[PDB]
Amino acid sequence: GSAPKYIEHFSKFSPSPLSMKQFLDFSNACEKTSFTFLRQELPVRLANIMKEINLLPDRVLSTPSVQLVQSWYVQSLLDIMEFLDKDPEDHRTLSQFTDALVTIRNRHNDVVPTMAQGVLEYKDTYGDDPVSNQNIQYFLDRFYLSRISIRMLINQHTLIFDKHIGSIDPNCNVSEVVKDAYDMAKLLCDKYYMASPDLEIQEINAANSKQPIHMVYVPSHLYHMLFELFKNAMRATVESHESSLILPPIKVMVALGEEDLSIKMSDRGGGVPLRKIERLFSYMYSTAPGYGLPISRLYAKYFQGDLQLFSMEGFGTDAVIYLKALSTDSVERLPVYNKSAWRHYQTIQEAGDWC
Amino acid sequence: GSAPKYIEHFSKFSPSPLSMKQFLDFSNACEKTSFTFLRQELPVRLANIMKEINLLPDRVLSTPSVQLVQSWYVQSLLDIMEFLDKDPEDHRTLSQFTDALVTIRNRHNDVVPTMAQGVLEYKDTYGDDPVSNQNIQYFLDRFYLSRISIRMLINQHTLIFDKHIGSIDPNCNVSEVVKDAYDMAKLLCDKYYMASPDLEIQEINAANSKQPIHMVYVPSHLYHMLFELFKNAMRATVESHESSLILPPIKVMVALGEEDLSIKMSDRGGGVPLRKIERLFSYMYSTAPGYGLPISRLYAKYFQGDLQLFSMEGFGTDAVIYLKALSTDSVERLPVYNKSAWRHYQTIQEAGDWC
Ligand SMILES: C[C@@H]1CN(C(=O)[C@@](C)(O)C(F)(F)F)[C@@H](C)CN1C(=O)c1ccc(C#N)cc1
Numbered sequence: 001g002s003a004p005k006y007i008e009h010f011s012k013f014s015p016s017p018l019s020m021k022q023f024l025d026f027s028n029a030c031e032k033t034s035f036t037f038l039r040q041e042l043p044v045r046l047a048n049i050m051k052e053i054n055l056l057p058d059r060v061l062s063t064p065s066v067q068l069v070q071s072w073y074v075q076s077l078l079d080i081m082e083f084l085d086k087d088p089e090d091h092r093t094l095s096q097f098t099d100a101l102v103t104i105r106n107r108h109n110d111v112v113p114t115m116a117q118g119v120l121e122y123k124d125t126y127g128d129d130p131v132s133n134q135n136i137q138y139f140l141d142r143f144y145l146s147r148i149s150i151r152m153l154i155n156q157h158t159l160i161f162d163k164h165i166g167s168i169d170p171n172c173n174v175s176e177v178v179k180d181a182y183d184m185a186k187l188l189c190d191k192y193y194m195a196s197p198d199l200e201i202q203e204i205n206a207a208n209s210k211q212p213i214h215m216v217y218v219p220s221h222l223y224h225m226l227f228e229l230f231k232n233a234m235r236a237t238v239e240s241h242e243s244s245l246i247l248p249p250i251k252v253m254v255a256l257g258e259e260d261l262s263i264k265m266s267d268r269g270g271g272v273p274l275r276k277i278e279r280l281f282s283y284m285y286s287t288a289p290g291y292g293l294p295i296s297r298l299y300a301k302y303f304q305g306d307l308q309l310f311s312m313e314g315f316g317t318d319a320v321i322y323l324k325a326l327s328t329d330s331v332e333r334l335p336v337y338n339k340s341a342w343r344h345y346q347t348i349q350e351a352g353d354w355c
Numbered sequence: 356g357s358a359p360k361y362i363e364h365f366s367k368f369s370p371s372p373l374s375m376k377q378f379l380d381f382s383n384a385c386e387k388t389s390f391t392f393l394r395q396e397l398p399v400r401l402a403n404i405m406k407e408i409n410l411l412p413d414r415v416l417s418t419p420s421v422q423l424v425q426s427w428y429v430q431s432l433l434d435i436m437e438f439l440d441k442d443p444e445d446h447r448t449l450s451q452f453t454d455a456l457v458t459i460r461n462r463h464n465d466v467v468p469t470m471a472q473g474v475l476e477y478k479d480t481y482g483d484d485p486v487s488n489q490n491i492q493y494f495l496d497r498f499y500l501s502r503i504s505i506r507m508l509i510n511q512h513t514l515i516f517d518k519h520i521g522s523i524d525p526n527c528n529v530s531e532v533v534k535d536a537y538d539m540a541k542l543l544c545d546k547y548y549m550a551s552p553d554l555e556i557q558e559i560n561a562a563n564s565k566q567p568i569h570m571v572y573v574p575s576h577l578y579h580m581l582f583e584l585f586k587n588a589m590r591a592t593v594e595s596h597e598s599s600l601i602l603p604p605i606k607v608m609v610a611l612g613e614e615d616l617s618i619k620m621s622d623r624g625g626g627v628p629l630r631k632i633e634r635l636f637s638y639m640y641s642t643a644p645g646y647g648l649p650i651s652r653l654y655a656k657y658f659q660g661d662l663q664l665f666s667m668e669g670f671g672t673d674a675v676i677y678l679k680a681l682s683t684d685s686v687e688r689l690p691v692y693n694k695s696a697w698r699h700y701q702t703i704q705e706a707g708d709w710c
Pocket residue numbers: 016018019022023026033034035037038152153154156157160
């Protein structure tokens with residue numbers, strides 16, 4: 001019965017944002033060195049997000065969803081406390097940990113669908129107004145980024161201690177990951193629509209005209225973003241041309257500049273009105289009766305990147321993923337609990353500044 | 356010595372956002388009808404913006420710039436009070452007005468450069484930090500939109516009472532306005548660089564495949580936005596290819612959908628890092644030792660549109676202007692003084708929610 005205490009403790013610490021090069025330095029660059037680090041970091045990260053939840057309307061708190069996941073974190077937090085007084089050296093004290101991590105990871109595997117359920121519960125229970133949308137948007141963005149960062153650490157440890165350093169590829173060939181996400185989307189598009197647009201890729205390596213474009217990144221993260229975009233671009237190109245015979249291709253450009261590595265995906269799927277675009281990244285409005293876009297964007301932001309959309313109604317849409325080109329600039333984007341984060345939930349909107 | 360009083364009065368009223376079709380209904384759809392309207396509207400709009408200024412740091416208030424323009428509005432407000440007790444019918448009582456408008460318009464002709472001077476005064480006097488940037492951004496956006504809306508009314512009256520209804524073209528051929536802004540930028544580009552990229556235009560009239568794209572809009576407003584973008588796209592295409600012989604063209608696409616009319620301008624001028632883009636629309640950071648972009652965007656927003664940028668470092672930049680396709684949806688976007696607008700100036704930032 002000391003959960004509130006632990007959370008009060010570790011909640012006082014700020015999480016330590018790691019860079020992608022520090023990740024590259026790490027089989028056996030001492031997991032002892034990691035164990036001791038993860039012993040404090042995970043609890044600090046779990047506690048900060050747990051501390052922020054506890055401070056949202058009891059209307060949201062009392063729902064089975066929020067309390068279900070809120071109880072998952074409480075258990076994961078306790079699940080790792082065990083090792084605070086333990087001593088490494090014991091080749092079994094740190095394997096008790098790797099297992100303790102794999103067990104915590106799977107315990108949270110369905111947090112996204114679970115949390116989406118809460119959004120729906122809220123829409124039908126309290127309505128879908130801007131202030132609700134705003135608070136949910138603010139919180140889910142932080143909650144999910146928090147989750148992404150925790151899973152990153154866990155995957156890095158579990159994978160490294162069972163060319164690639166954990167889930168990191170130091171020579172990630174962006175165009176290859178583009179092709180992979182494409183092939184997968186194509187296969188699904190073919191089954192469901194029995195027709196699919198082709199793919200054209202083009203690279204622009206500013207500094208080195210023909211050297212293939214490589215970067216240090218987490219391929220699975222990039223695959224996720226690209227796959228989500230290919231699906232939308234495919235669904236729209238197919239559906240908007242159901243009476244046309246032509247079927248334009250989806251074009252992708254990978255450009256590498258001094259500090260940015262950009263990927264643009266252009267489709268001619270009809271486009272979307274500016275007003276609806278703004279709603280495409282909102283958890284509340286994109287819920288019924290998925291969260292590919294809002295979450296794909298958190299993956300972009302996690303390492304200081306971004307994901308943006310801009311279409312032309314009546315023509316098509318461009319989706320662009322901005323990633324940092326240098327591993328030096330690829331530092332975790334983490335949400336922290338402060339007096340600053342507190343007042344973002346004090347939105348008392350009623351009659352704006354514009355008419 | 357009653358300025359504070361008048362401002363306290365009219366400041367209680369909210370400005371009346373007009374649609375572009377109401378503008379189309381109006382030589383002599385009775386300027387009496389307008390005179391009486393503008394008699395209350397202008398004072399209400401002048402007072403609301405004047406009321407918001409009076410409530411910004413005295414550090415900003417005391418500068419010659421802010422007080423210089425603050426005294427211009429005070430005089431324009433009084434300049435129109437005169438007609439509050441007047442009676443139309445008198446064919447000279449309303450010409451005293453048209454002149455009173457032309458005189459007020461010119462009195463404010465240099466408010467932009469004047470206000471930009473204040474920004475610089477502030478940068479050097481108090482520094483250029485995010486909270487300063489934010490408050491200036493918030494206020495200048497509103498101040499300038501307020502100004503744009505006031506000049507719109509004035510121009511509509513003065514022009515209509517000296518095919519087009521004032522400054523409104525009910526059959527504005529977007530592609531023609533594109534060509535015009537281009538020719539002008541080209542001429543300047545040719546003088547200064549003695550080389551300039553060509554232009555390709557393409558239309559996508561979704562509903563009517565080949566009918567030229569026309570819309571009801573204020574051509575001079577659209578010309579302003581396009582000219583500003585062509586200049587930047589030209590400067591960058593030329594400068595980034597000073598050692599290349601090839602010189603790609605600037606491509607523009609005009610797409611007309613059910614509710615949106617979009618114009619995209621794509622250049623291959625090298626592109627800009629994501630981090631600097633965010634700073635391109637900031638009055639503070641774009642000041643030295645112009646305001647084409649931040650202001651061009653207010654012109655887009657004035658009638659519910661927008662202006663966005665997205666480039667690929669090492670390749671080029673896309674700039675897109677979103678306008679409403681229907682005159683029904685083209686309603687003035689006006690800033691209003693409320694308890695809502697008040698708290699946007701209570702930014703006490705110090706240590707954010709992210710680490
Ligand atoms: C041991 C820590 C964490 N780490 C790891 O690779 C992992 C696999 O253990 C994990 F992904 F799980 F984090 C490197 C960034 C090196 N590293 C550090 O450089 C470090 C960072 C901050 C502190 C502190 N305080 C101490 C060490």
